[PDB]
């Protein structure tokens, strides 16, 4: 999970499928839409 959320999904919600290999290896690749929060520093506007 991400700690910098702001009114959004904490975790991935699609829960796609994942690959398993015979050796016991597993790979997973879900898409997600995240909404993080930035310390927007606007001094050299617009050359920022």
């Amino acid at each position: 999970v991400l700690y910098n959320n702001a009114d959004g999904d904490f975790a991935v919600t699609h829960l796609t499928k994942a690959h398993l290999f015979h050796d016991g290896r597993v790979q997973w690749t879900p898409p997600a839409i995240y909404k993080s929060s930035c310390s927007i520093d606007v001094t050299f506007f617009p050359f920022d």
Binding site: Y3, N4, N5, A6, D7, S37
Partner: protein
């Protein structure tokens, strides 16, 4: 592998909605704590405050006890919060 056995044992006949106390007269202690990630927004026109909140809840019951010396010295195991009782705050 021992954690799996402990989990399988302690979820044998544990019910969720049954209030987990020995004697009905006895009560629980729900220690409560609050934490703020960020004061996201304070919309004064609509009088609404959107905050990001960590809620810390602490309690204890009797049915989820075991002996650590019987399972290769394990003391802290995870479980999903969906399967156990949960005081609604």
């Amino acid at each position: 592998h021992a954690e799996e056995r402990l989990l399988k044992k302690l979820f044998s006949g544990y019910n969720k909605w049954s209030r987990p106390v020995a004697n009905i007269s006895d009560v629980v202690l729900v220690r409560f704590g609050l934490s703020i990630a960020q004061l996201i927004d304070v919309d004064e026109k609509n009088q609404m405050m959107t905050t990001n909140v960590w809620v810390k809840q602490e309690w204890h019951d009797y049915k989820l006890r075991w002996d650590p010396a019987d399972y290769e010295n394990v003391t802290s195991i995870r479980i999903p919060s969906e399967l156990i009782w949960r005081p609604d705050i």
